[PDB]
Subunit: 131 residues, 3 copies
Amino acid sequence: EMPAFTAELTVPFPPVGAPVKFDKLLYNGRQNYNPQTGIFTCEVPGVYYFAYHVHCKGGNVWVALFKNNEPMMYTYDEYKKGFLDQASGSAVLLLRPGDQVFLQMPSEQAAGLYAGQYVHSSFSGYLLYPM
Amino acid sequence: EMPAFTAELTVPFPPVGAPVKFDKLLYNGRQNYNPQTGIFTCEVPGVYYFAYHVHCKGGNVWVALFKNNEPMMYTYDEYKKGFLDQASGSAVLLLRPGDQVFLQMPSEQAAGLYAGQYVHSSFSGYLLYPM
Amino acid sequence: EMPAFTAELTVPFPPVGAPVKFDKLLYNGRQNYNPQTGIFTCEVPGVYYFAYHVHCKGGNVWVALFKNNEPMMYTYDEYKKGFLDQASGSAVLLLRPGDQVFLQMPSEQAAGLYAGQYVHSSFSGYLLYPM
Protein backbone atom coordinates (compact mmCIF):
# COMPACT_ATOMS: atom_id res chain seq x y z
CA GLU A 1 0.00 0.00 0.00
CA MET A 2 0.96 3.62 -0.57
CA PRO A 3 0.49 6.30 2.13
CA ALA A 4 -2.87 8.03 1.57
CA PHE A 5 -5.85 8.87 3.76
CA THR A 6 -9.06 10.83 4.20
CA ALA A 7 -10.65 11.31 7.62
CA GLU A 8 -13.82 13.20 8.53
CA LEU A 9 -14.99 15.03 11.65
CA THR A 10 -18.65 14.56 12.63
CA VAL A 11 -18.88 16.43 15.94
CA PRO A 12 -18.54 20.22 16.15
CA PHE A 13 -16.13 22.25 18.26
CA PRO A 14 -13.10 19.99 18.89
CA PRO A 15 -10.33 20.90 21.39
CA VAL A 16 -8.18 23.97 20.78
CA GLY A 17 -4.40 23.62 20.87
CA ALA A 18 -4.35 19.95 19.92
CA PRO A 19 -4.53 18.01 16.64
CA VAL A 20 -8.09 17.76 15.37
CA LYS A 21 -9.06 14.11 15.70
CA PHE A 22 -10.77 13.47 12.35
CA ASP A 23 -11.99 9.95 13.09
CA LYS A 24 -14.29 8.77 10.27
CA LEU A 25 -11.96 7.08 7.78
CA LEU A 26 -12.56 6.68 4.05
CA TYR A 27 -9.11 5.24 3.39
CA ASN A 28 -5.83 4.89 5.29
CA GLY A 29 -3.10 3.21 3.26
CA ARG A 30 -0.24 1.89 5.40
CA GLN A 31 -2.16 3.22 8.41
CA ASN A 32 0.15 6.24 8.61
CA TYR A 33 -2.76 8.38 9.87
CA ASN A 34 -4.05 7.79 13.41
CA PRO A 35 -7.73 8.65 14.00
CA GLN A 36 -7.04 8.48 17.74
CA THR A 37 -4.56 11.36 17.60
CA GLY A 38 -5.39 13.17 14.36
CA ILE A 39 -1.77 12.88 13.28
CA PHE A 40 -0.24 11.61 10.05
CA THR A 41 3.25 10.23 10.70
CA CYS A 42 5.66 9.98 7.76
CA GLU A 43 6.95 6.47 7.12
CA VAL A 44 7.85 6.88 3.45
CA PRO A 45 10.18 9.87 2.72
CA GLY A 46 8.99 12.14 -0.06
CA VAL A 47 6.72 14.85 -1.42
CA TYR A 48 3.14 14.81 -0.12
CA TYR A 49 -0.10 16.66 -0.78
CA PHE A 50 -2.49 17.49 2.06
CA ALA A 51 -5.94 19.01 1.93
CA TYR A 52 -8.43 20.12 4.56
CA HIS A 53 -11.93 21.56 4.67
CA VAL A 54 -13.32 23.03 7.86
CA HIS A 55 -16.77 24.44 8.48
CA CYS A 56 -17.34 27.53 10.59
CA LYS A 57 -20.24 28.46 12.86
CA GLY A 58 -20.90 30.21 16.16
CA GLY A 59 -17.44 31.71 16.19
CA ASN A 60 -14.46 32.58 14.00
CA VAL A 61 -12.11 29.73 13.14
CA TRP A 62 -8.34 29.83 12.69
CA VAL A 63 -6.53 26.64 11.72
CA ALA A 64 -2.98 25.82 10.72
CA LEU A 65 -1.60 22.79 8.95
CA PHE A 66 1.40 21.83 11.07
CA LYS A 67 4.53 19.86 10.21
CA ASN A 68 5.69 19.05 13.73
CA ASN A 69 5.73 22.44 15.52
CA GLU A 70 5.91 24.54 12.34
CA PRO A 71 2.75 26.22 10.96
CA MET A 72 3.00 25.57 7.21
CA MET A 73 -0.32 27.12 6.19
CA TYR A 74 -2.95 29.29 7.91
CA THR A 75 -6.66 29.46 7.14
CA TYR A 76 -8.96 31.94 8.85
CA ASP A 77 -12.71 32.38 8.56
CA GLU A 78 -15.03 34.81 10.32
CA TYR A 79 -18.41 33.37 11.23
CA LYS A 80 -21.31 34.78 9.24
CA LYS A 81 -23.84 35.79 11.90
CA GLY A 82 -26.33 32.93 12.17
CA PHE A 83 -25.10 30.94 9.18
CA LEU A 84 -22.82 27.99 8.48
CA ASP A 85 -19.73 28.65 6.35
CA GLN A 86 -16.58 26.83 5.24
CA ALA A 87 -12.90 27.43 4.41
CA SER A 88 -10.35 25.08 2.84
CA GLY A 89 -6.65 24.67 2.22
CA SER A 90 -4.15 22.36 0.56
CA ALA A 91 -0.39 22.12 0.34
CA VAL A 92 2.52 20.20 -1.08
CA LEU A 93 5.09 19.32 1.58
CA LEU A 94 8.44 17.54 1.54
CA LEU A 95 8.39 15.14 4.49
CA ARG A 96 11.21 13.42 6.34
CA PRO A 97 10.71 10.05 8.08
CA GLY A 98 9.11 10.78 11.43
CA ASP A 99 7.52 14.11 10.56
CA GLN A 100 4.08 14.55 12.09
CA VAL A 101 1.43 16.48 10.13
CA PHE A 102 -1.93 17.61 11.48
CA LEU A 103 -4.48 20.43 11.59
CA GLN A 104 -4.88 22.50 14.74
CA MET A 105 -6.57 25.63 16.06
CA PRO A 106 -3.93 27.80 17.81
CA SER A 107 -6.37 30.23 19.43
CA GLU A 108 -9.17 29.89 21.98
CA GLN A 109 -10.54 33.10 20.46
CA ALA A 110 -11.22 31.42 17.09
CA ALA A 111 -12.47 27.92 17.88
CA GLY A 112 -15.61 27.81 15.73
CA LEU A 113 -14.60 24.66 13.83
CA TYR A 114 -17.94 23.06 12.94
CA ALA A 115 -18.93 19.55 11.83
CA GLY A 116 -21.92 17.23 12.06
CA GLN A 117 -23.36 13.83 11.20
CA TYR A 118 -24.23 15.21 7.76
CA VAL A 119 -21.71 18.05 7.53
CA HIS A 120 -18.16 16.69 7.26
CA SER A 121 -15.07 18.76 7.96
CA SER A 122 -12.14 16.70 6.65
CA PHE A 123 -8.40 16.11 6.35
CA SER A 124 -6.66 14.17 3.56
CA GLY A 125 -3.08 13.44 2.58
CA TYR A 126 -1.10 11.24 0.23
CA LEU A 127 2.35 10.52 -1.16
CA LEU A 128 3.16 12.13 -4.51
CA TYR A 129 6.82 11.23 -5.05
CA PRO A 130 9.02 8.97 -2.89
CA MET A 131 12.35 10.67 -2.14
CA GLU B 1 -3.67 6.81 -20.85
CA MET B 2 -4.36 7.47 -17.15
CA PRO B 3 -7.84 8.13 -15.67
CA ALA B 4 -8.18 11.81 -14.73
CA PHE B 5 -10.78 14.52 -15.30
CA THR B 6 -12.21 17.92 -14.43
CA ALA B 7 -15.80 18.76 -15.32
CA GLU B 8 -17.50 22.10 -14.71
CA LEU B 9 -21.22 22.80 -14.29
CA THR B 10 -22.36 25.79 -16.35
CA VAL B 11 -26.09 25.58 -15.67
CA PRO B 12 -27.56 26.23 -12.20
CA PHE B 13 -29.89 24.08 -10.12
CA PRO B 14 -29.49 20.45 -11.27
CA PRO B 15 -32.03 17.78 -10.20
CA VAL B 16 -32.04 16.34 -6.68
CA GLY B 17 -31.68 12.60 -6.14
CA ALA B 18 -29.51 12.02 -9.21
CA PRO B 19 -25.82 12.50 -10.11
CA VAL B 20 -24.97 16.13 -10.81
CA LYS B 21 -24.15 16.33 -14.50
CA PHE B 22 -21.09 18.58 -14.74
CA ASP B 23 -21.15 19.27 -18.50
CA LYS B 24 -17.97 21.19 -19.45
CA LEU B 25 -14.80 19.09 -19.69
CA LEU B 26 -11.29 20.52 -19.21
CA TYR B 27 -9.72 17.07 -19.35
CA ASN B 28 -11.01 13.51 -19.42
CA GLY B 29 -8.24 10.96 -19.82
CA ARG B 30 -9.65 7.51 -20.63
CA GLN B 31 -13.04 9.26 -20.65
CA ASN B 32 -14.12 7.53 -17.45
CA TYR B 33 -16.23 10.55 -16.52
CA ASN B 34 -19.38 10.89 -18.60
CA PRO B 35 -21.00 14.36 -18.89
CA GLN B 36 -24.27 12.65 -19.81
CA THR B 37 -24.47 10.83 -16.47
CA GLY B 38 -22.27 12.89 -14.14
CA ILE B 39 -20.66 9.62 -13.08
CA PHE B 40 -17.00 8.63 -12.92
CA THR B 41 -16.75 4.89 -13.59
CA CYS B 42 -13.67 3.02 -12.40
CA GLU B 43 -11.98 1.13 -15.22
CA VAL B 44 -8.49 0.91 -13.73
CA PRO B 45 -8.49 -0.48 -10.14
CA GLY B 46 -6.68 1.59 -7.52
CA VAL B 47 -6.58 4.54 -5.15
CA TYR B 48 -8.21 7.73 -6.42
CA TYR B 49 -8.52 11.32 -5.29
CA PHE B 50 -11.63 13.40 -5.96
CA ALA B 51 -12.21 17.11 -5.42
CA TYR B 52 -15.33 19.20 -5.85
CA HIS B 53 -16.45 22.80 -5.48
CA VAL B 54 -20.10 23.80 -5.38
CA HIS B 55 -21.60 27.27 -5.34
CA CYS B 56 -24.57 28.15 -3.18
CA LYS B 57 -27.24 30.67 -4.14
CA GLY B 58 -30.99 31.12 -3.77
CA GLY B 59 -31.15 28.30 -1.26
CA ASN B 60 -29.18 25.97 1.01
CA VAL B 61 -27.14 23.24 -0.67
CA TRP B 62 -26.50 19.76 0.71
CA VAL B 63 -24.46 17.41 -1.46
CA ALA B 64 -22.70 14.11 -0.94
CA LEU B 65 -19.86 12.37 -2.74
CA PHE B 66 -21.12 8.84 -3.40
CA LYS B 67 -19.28 5.62 -4.11
CA ASN B 68 -21.98 3.50 -5.73
CA ASN B 69 -24.95 3.79 -3.37
CA GLU B 70 -22.98 4.81 -0.29
CA PRO B 71 -22.60 8.49 0.75
CA MET B 72 -18.89 8.86 1.54
CA MET B 73 -18.70 12.57 2.31
CA TYR B 74 -21.31 15.22 3.14
CA THR B 75 -20.94 18.91 2.37
CA TYR B 76 -23.45 21.52 3.48
CA ASP B 77 -23.77 25.27 3.01
CA GLU B 78 -26.47 27.75 3.96
CA TYR B 79 -27.49 30.46 1.52
CA LYS B 80 -26.10 33.81 2.66
CA LYS B 81 -29.11 36.14 2.28
CA GLY B 82 -28.57 37.32 -1.30
CA PHE B 83 -24.85 36.56 -1.62
CA LEU B 84 -23.12 33.92 -3.75
CA ASP B 85 -21.14 31.44 -1.64
CA GLN B 86 -19.14 28.25 -2.11
CA ALA B 87 -18.33 25.01 -0.29
CA SER B 88 -15.80 22.33 -1.24
CA GLY B 89 -14.65 18.82 -0.49
CA SER B 90 -12.11 16.20 -1.49
CA ALA B 91 -11.52 12.56 -0.71
CA VAL B 92 -9.25 9.58 -1.26
CA LEU B 93 -11.09 6.39 -2.22
CA LEU B 94 -9.99 2.87 -3.13
CA LEU B 95 -11.97 1.85 -6.22
CA ARG B 96 -12.59 -1.44 -8.01
CA PRO B 97 -13.67 -1.95 -11.64
CA GLY B 98 -17.27 -0.84 -12.05
CA ASP B 99 -17.38 1.39 -8.96
CA GLN B 100 -19.17 4.67 -9.60
CA VAL B 101 -18.31 8.00 -7.99
CA PHE B 102 -20.47 11.10 -8.29
CA LEU B 103 -22.00 14.05 -6.46
CA GLN B 104 -25.68 14.09 -5.57
CA MET B 105 -28.05 16.23 -3.50
CA PRO B 106 -30.33 14.09 -1.30
CA SER B 107 -32.93 16.76 -0.48
CA GLU B 108 -35.23 19.21 -2.25
CA GLN B 109 -34.92 21.28 0.93
CA ALA B 110 -31.30 22.08 0.09
CA ALA B 111 -30.84 22.06 -3.68
CA GLY B 112 -29.41 25.54 -4.20
CA LEU B 113 -26.39 24.26 -6.13
CA TYR B 114 -25.51 27.24 -8.34
CA ALA B 115 -23.47 27.59 -11.54
CA GLY B 116 -22.94 29.98 -14.44
CA GLN B 117 -20.86 30.79 -17.53
CA TYR B 118 -18.44 32.74 -15.36
CA VAL B 119 -19.18 30.90 -12.11
CA HIS B 120 -18.02 27.28 -12.36
CA SER B 121 -19.07 24.56 -9.93
CA SER B 122 -16.76 21.60 -10.51
CA PHE B 123 -15.84 17.97 -9.95
CA SER B 124 -12.38 16.45 -10.50
CA GLY B 125 -10.81 13.05 -9.99
CA TYR B 126 -7.70 11.07 -10.85
CA LEU B 127 -5.88 7.81 -10.25
CA LEU B 128 -3.15 7.98 -7.61
CA TYR B 129 -1.92 4.39 -7.37
CA PRO B 130 -2.96 1.43 -9.56
CA MET B 131 -4.01 -1.52 -7.39
CA GLU C 1 13.07 15.93 -8.59
CA MET C 2 9.46 16.10 -9.78
CA PRO C 3 7.52 19.31 -10.56
CA ALA C 4 5.35 20.28 -7.57
CA PHE C 5 4.78 23.46 -5.60
CA THR C 6 2.67 25.40 -3.14
CA ALA C 7 3.00 29.17 -2.91
CA GLU C 8 1.21 31.35 -0.39
CA LEU C 9 0.24 35.03 -0.43
CA THR C 10 0.58 36.95 2.85
CA VAL C 11 -0.30 40.51 1.77
CA PRO C 12 -3.76 41.62 0.56
CA PHE C 13 -5.09 42.99 -2.71
CA PRO C 14 -2.66 41.85 -5.42
CA PRO C 15 -2.95 43.99 -8.58
CA VAL C 16 -5.60 43.16 -11.18
CA GLY C 17 -4.62 42.35 -14.77
CA ALA C 18 -1.45 40.44 -13.91
CA PRO C 19 -0.60 37.07 -12.32
CA VAL C 20 -1.03 36.96 -8.55
CA LYS C 21 2.47 36.67 -7.10
CA PHE C 22 2.21 34.03 -4.37
CA ASP C 23 5.72 34.30 -2.92
CA LYS C 24 5.88 32.26 0.31
CA LEU C 25 6.98 28.81 -0.90
CA LEU C 26 6.42 25.52 0.93
CA TYR C 27 7.97 23.40 -1.82
CA ASN C 28 9.04 24.00 -5.41
CA GLY C 29 10.40 20.89 -7.09
CA ARG C 30 12.46 21.67 -10.20
CA GLN C 31 11.71 25.33 -9.49
CA ASN C 32 9.14 25.42 -12.29
CA TYR C 33 7.08 27.93 -10.30
CA ASN C 34 8.46 31.49 -10.16
CA PRO C 35 7.71 33.51 -6.96
CA GLN C 36 8.70 36.67 -8.85
CA THR C 37 5.99 36.23 -11.48
CA GLY C 38 3.40 33.93 -9.96
CA ILE C 39 3.73 31.76 -13.05
CA PHE C 40 4.24 28.01 -13.28
CA THR C 41 6.10 27.16 -16.48
CA CYS C 42 5.88 23.60 -17.72
CA GLU C 43 9.22 21.86 -18.19
CA VAL C 44 8.10 18.22 -18.00
CA PRO C 45 5.24 17.46 -20.43
CA GLY C 46 2.23 15.74 -18.91
CA VAL C 47 -1.01 15.85 -16.95
CA TYR C 48 -1.02 18.25 -13.99
CA TYR C 49 -3.34 19.08 -11.12
CA PHE C 50 -3.66 22.64 -9.86
CA ALA C 51 -5.51 23.89 -6.80
CA TYR C 52 -6.02 27.35 -5.36
CA HIS C 53 -7.70 28.98 -2.38
CA VAL C 54 -8.41 32.71 -2.40
CA HIS C 55 -9.89 34.77 0.41
CA CYS C 56 -12.37 37.57 -0.20
CA LYS C 57 -12.69 40.80 1.78
CA GLY C 58 -13.94 44.33 1.09
CA GLY C 59 -14.92 43.55 -2.47
CA ASN C 60 -16.07 40.71 -4.71
CA VAL C 61 -13.40 38.40 -6.07
CA TRP C 62 -13.33 37.14 -9.65
CA VAL C 63 -10.23 35.14 -10.55
CA ALA C 64 -9.35 32.71 -13.31
CA LEU C 65 -6.84 29.91 -13.68
CA PHE C 66 -5.08 30.63 -16.97
CA LYS C 67 -3.14 28.35 -19.29
CA ASN C 68 -1.12 30.76 -21.42
CA ASN C 69 -3.69 33.35 -22.56
CA GLU C 70 -6.80 31.18 -22.14
CA PRO C 71 -9.08 31.22 -19.05
CA MET C 72 -9.51 27.56 -18.09
CA MET C 73 -11.58 28.00 -14.95
CA TYR C 74 -13.42 30.89 -13.28
CA THR C 75 -13.94 31.33 -9.55
CA TYR C 76 -16.22 34.04 -8.19
CA ASP C 77 -17.15 35.14 -4.69
CA GLU C 78 -19.35 37.97 -3.47
CA TYR C 79 -17.88 39.61 -0.38
CA LYS C 80 -19.99 39.19 2.74
CA LYS C 81 -20.13 42.80 3.97
CA GLY C 82 -17.93 42.99 7.04
CA PHE C 83 -16.55 39.45 7.10
CA LEU C 84 -13.70 37.54 5.49
CA ASP C 85 -14.75 34.73 3.14
CA GLN C 86 -13.07 32.24 0.81
CA ALA C 87 -13.57 30.40 -2.50
CA SER C 88 -11.48 27.65 -4.09
CA GLY C 89 -10.83 25.86 -7.36
CA SER C 90 -9.13 22.71 -8.68
CA ALA C 91 -8.26 21.63 -12.22
CA VAL C 92 -6.54 18.82 -14.11
CA LEU C 93 -4.68 20.16 -17.14
CA LEU C 94 -2.63 18.58 -19.91
CA LEU C 95 0.47 20.74 -20.33
CA ARG C 96 3.13 20.97 -23.04
CA PRO C 97 6.66 22.36 -22.57
CA GLY C 98 6.51 26.11 -22.09
CA ASP C 99 2.84 26.28 -21.09
CA GLN C 100 2.25 28.85 -18.36
CA VAL C 101 -0.32 28.40 -15.60
CA PHE C 102 -1.24 31.21 -13.22
CA LEU C 103 -4.08 32.98 -11.42
CA GLN C 104 -5.32 36.41 -12.43
CA MET C 105 -8.21 38.76 -11.69
CA PRO C 106 -9.63 40.25 -14.91
CA SER C 107 -11.69 43.08 -13.39
CA GLU C 108 -11.08 46.03 -11.06
CA GLN C 109 -14.74 45.58 -10.13
CA ALA C 110 -13.96 42.37 -8.24
CA ALA C 111 -10.42 42.56 -6.87
CA GLY C 112 -11.06 41.90 -3.19
CA LEU C 113 -8.55 39.04 -3.02
CA TYR C 114 -7.40 39.04 0.61
CA ALA C 115 -4.45 37.59 2.53
CA GLY C 116 -2.44 38.32 5.66
CA GLN C 117 0.32 36.94 7.88
CA TYR C 118 -2.41 34.94 9.63
CA VAL C 119 -4.38 33.82 6.56
CA HIS C 120 -2.88 32.48 3.34
CA SER C 121 -4.50 32.56 -0.07
CA SER C 122 -2.59 29.95 -2.07
CA PHE C 123 -1.73 28.27 -5.36
CA SER C 124 -0.50 24.69 -5.75
CA GLY C 125 0.32 22.39 -8.65
CA TYR C 126 2.06 19.12 -9.45
CA LEU C 127 2.72 16.56 -12.15
CA LEU C 128 0.44 13.53 -12.15
CA TYR C 129 1.46 11.67 -15.30
CA PRO C 130 4.46 12.45 -17.54
CA MET C 131 3.67 12.22 -21.24
